[PDB]
Amino acid sequence: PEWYKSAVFYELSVRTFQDGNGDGKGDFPGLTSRLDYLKNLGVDCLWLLPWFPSPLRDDGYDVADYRGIHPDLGTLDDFKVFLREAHARGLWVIGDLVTNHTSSDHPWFQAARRGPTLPDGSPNEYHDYYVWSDEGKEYADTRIIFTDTEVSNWTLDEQAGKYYWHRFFASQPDLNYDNPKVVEELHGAARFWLDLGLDGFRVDAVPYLIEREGTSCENLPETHEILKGFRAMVDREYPGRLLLAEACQWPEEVVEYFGTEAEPEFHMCFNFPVMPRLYMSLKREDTSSIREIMGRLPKIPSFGQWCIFLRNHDELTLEMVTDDERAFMYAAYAPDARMKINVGIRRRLAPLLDNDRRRIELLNTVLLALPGSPVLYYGDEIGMGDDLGLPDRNGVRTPMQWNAGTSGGFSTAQPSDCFFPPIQDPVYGFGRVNVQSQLQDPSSLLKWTARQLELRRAHPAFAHGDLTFIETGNPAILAFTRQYDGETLLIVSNFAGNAQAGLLDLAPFVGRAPVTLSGASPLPVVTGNGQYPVVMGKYDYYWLRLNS
Amino acid sequence: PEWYKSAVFYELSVRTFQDGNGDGKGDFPGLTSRLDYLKNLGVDCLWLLPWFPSPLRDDGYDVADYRGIHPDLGTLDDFKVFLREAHARGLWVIGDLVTNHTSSDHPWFQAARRGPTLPDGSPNEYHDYYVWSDEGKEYADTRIIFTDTEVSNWTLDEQAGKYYWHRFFASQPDLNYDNPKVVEELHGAARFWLDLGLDGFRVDAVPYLIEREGTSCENLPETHEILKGFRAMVDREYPGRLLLAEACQWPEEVVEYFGTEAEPEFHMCFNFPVMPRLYMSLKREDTSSIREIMGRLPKIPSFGQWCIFLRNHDELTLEMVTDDERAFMYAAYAPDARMKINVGIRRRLAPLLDNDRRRIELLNTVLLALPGSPVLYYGDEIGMGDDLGLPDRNGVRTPMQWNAGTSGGFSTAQPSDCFFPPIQDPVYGFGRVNVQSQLQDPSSLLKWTARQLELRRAHPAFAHGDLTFIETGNPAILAFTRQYDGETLLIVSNFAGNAQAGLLDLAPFVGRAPVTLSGASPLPVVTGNGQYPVVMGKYDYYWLRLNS
Ligand SMILES: [Ca+2]
Ligand SMILES: [Ca+2]
Ligand SMILES: [Mg+2]
Ligand SMILES: [Mg+2]
């Protein structure tokens, strides 16, 4: 099976991981010097956030050169050293392809804004690279994604005297994918990095590629068309490489980004639909929305694999939940208005869960036990907090906390000279929360995460097995089976904060012997009608094997 | 009924708790300013470690003046203000009465080592306050308690040309309790403090008052008589004041330090027999130990109440335990040789349990649920560690860690200037383990301990009920009821580090529904023959209520 199906992912920003020269910004030489840490954590694949030259108006997602390294982060040779040294340890590394839009400082758009026709006689080839409007009335009935900061997806450009389109900030003008010249430009930027030996791409914001008047301008077939062209190129020209899609839509729409077996698209998509339902189910102590939303995801093609996660560099997004659910999630997890941003919640995993390690453990359990490949977000393995006095989603991207020395070992610059300030409070600051202390503590959250990934890595049914929900008689208790290659695991999880009893329907497995995955503690044989009484402590997780 | 039966005790030492004036030594003004903290934690009664003038060769337990305040800790003035502010918060205060022995620098031993008769001709009435011999040959068949330091319980005095008796250090000569003037002198010392409003005394080294030839010199009939007369004096004269006794012995001998209804002795005694079995059942994952030794405890008088603890200012003592049990304890809990001392182990609780919060919560659960009155060792509520670079048993008496500031908030003197250095290592140092942090953390151990304590006081069967073990089918699971005034608690505890199944024998309670104590979540009703199946996750505790 493909490497990505068996891999564990780790999402970092090199501007925020490890500063190597005291300017207060993370860089590639600083990341390289930490590769052993990630290896020994149990990670296989590093997903780096954008590293290209950029004014950093959307923290680097507004690219002004698709084929360079941002001068903050080092040189193209620093990048090459880092790639051969990650590969030498057997890590894979994937990039972030920002295909929907460039920065307005990108030279294509400095060219395009001159207008269809140059001051010179001739037509401007670059004008058609972007999406222009005389009045800016097209594509109405089209939501605004960045809702706390933009009032329209059209913006007036003094130079061109026309309107240009942008799904995100005005600093990020959309690329026009109806121009074949733009599709080649994208292909050629991907080739440049694959040629360097990068292992693949997380492709950002795929639903918003093609616009069409009279539609929502999400998930249009033309978009899927272009995406299949990209997969067809990679298949032909770089077999083995991974394309991974960010596509925050509803179950029915997300699954289309795998394409089909006849016409493949992405190898992987994030499982955005479950992520918010995990959090809500913990507050209602009812797990049915996990079962409902999981049950709407169809099966995916053979090459496919879900990517599963709890948090990331962005807001905990609520754009694709019911209106009732979003109101509930705000009251439950954003009690201060400062905690919201756009249509989401800008908080890290530990503070979302009141820093309760029993809860952090339970959720990481469910992350690791669901059909997919897990991606961890840097710092959640040590329980990092957030800095809510920082603009946009930056309070969730503070520097990695390595020890209790200057700026948590991230830099020898002082906290207020760092790009973002490292967190310094009594609960989450680097005095209390850092890698070094957790390397020496036998019962660390970090030690726990490592040992828990070891446990998954010894049981391939987690990566490759099917999934079937067991009836339980108690909505607080979620049980399911993962089956593959003969092995049958049974995962049992309590979303309630006190003891719960359940009655599992194990009728398909009468005569079988449940043992724990850790130390094979035996449990009673499934007998009779297979209805199986269980009791569970607050936030307990049972990882079982049903022996035939 | 009697206030000590229903109280939570907290053991601290003034010198290491809080320094008010910045000389690096804890003082009574500093302790006074922290009474809010202990009141809020849920503590009812402070239990102070010897505060008297001393050369501190055994850390205050070698007393040189029974009626004063050691100048390190302030004046008798400051101690008065302390008792007032404690009492104004509804806090009882008991002291330590060190009764078997005094310091070489006590005026009595100075006067006594001047021979049986003086230079002038008169008799020396002080020579007989202490126990002398000419050859040092009486009382073999007697052990050395400080096996690591002392080779004989006799020690020649250069100046008196005789040997004096001492159970502990040669710096702490044993007082002679065949001399009735000594008894009066102790009643005189106790009344000094009772008269100031102290609420009682723990009496240390109580089993060693009387020596007799041919005998063990422990637990002697004449020893209980002096004690019986101390109880009489107190009851007759300061009624309602508490007498607590440290007596590290086998169960059948410890129970008679209560004496009887006819002849009362102590109100309370430390339950030394069970405490080392909690630790052994954890490692063996086998609670048979605890049940064996609890059944060997005979019933106690009506005024009687056990005092349960996990740890104290001393080594974890293994003297009163089997050779095989001691070898098991050392291998499991003393990996390094200098963690051993005096047939014991000198580590604090959190290091003993590998800093595993699940293991720490579990044993605090059992401390709080066994029948008796619990005593907390200071800093265990936040998870302090120990320092083995300090001699003797001082490694567990580090300054209380209040916040991340200078010397952990214990003093403005910097760490090398403190009486004992405050701990600074990466796992248990004050930058990471401290009170202010855990006040702010919604999910801290300090907060878990306070909540668990107020969950206990809400259910008076813990303090007063009886105890009945319950069959379980699985040695790793301990289960028992506490019954009192028509309330039946049910306590189920998993001492294994993975999931365990049990069959709870609940026949008496058929028809009744087990209800969770935290949140009132109901479990299914006990049907059929009372055989009630359960599963439990690693180190789980269930605190249940049975309702008819
Ligand atoms: Ca677009
Ligand atoms: Ca004596
Ligand atoms: Mg730098
Ligand atoms: Mg002082």
TrEMBL record, chains A, B:
Catalysed reactions listed for this entry: D-maltose = alpha,alpha-trehalose
Gene Ontology MF annotations: maltose alpha-D-glucosyltransferase activity; metal ion binding
Record keyword Calcium present: yes
Pfam families in alphabetical order: Alpha-amylase, Malt_amylase_C
EC number(s) reported in the record: 5.4.99.16
Keyword Mitochondrion: no
Amino-acid positions noted as binding Mg(2+) in the UniProt annotation, renumbered to this chain: 19, 21, 23, 25, 27
Binding-site residues, Ca(2+): 100, 174, 208-209, 211
One of the GO BP terms on file: carbohydrate metabolic process
Annotated ranges, domain Glycosyl hydrolase family 13 catalytic: 11-411
Record protein name field: maltose alpha-D-glucosyltransferase
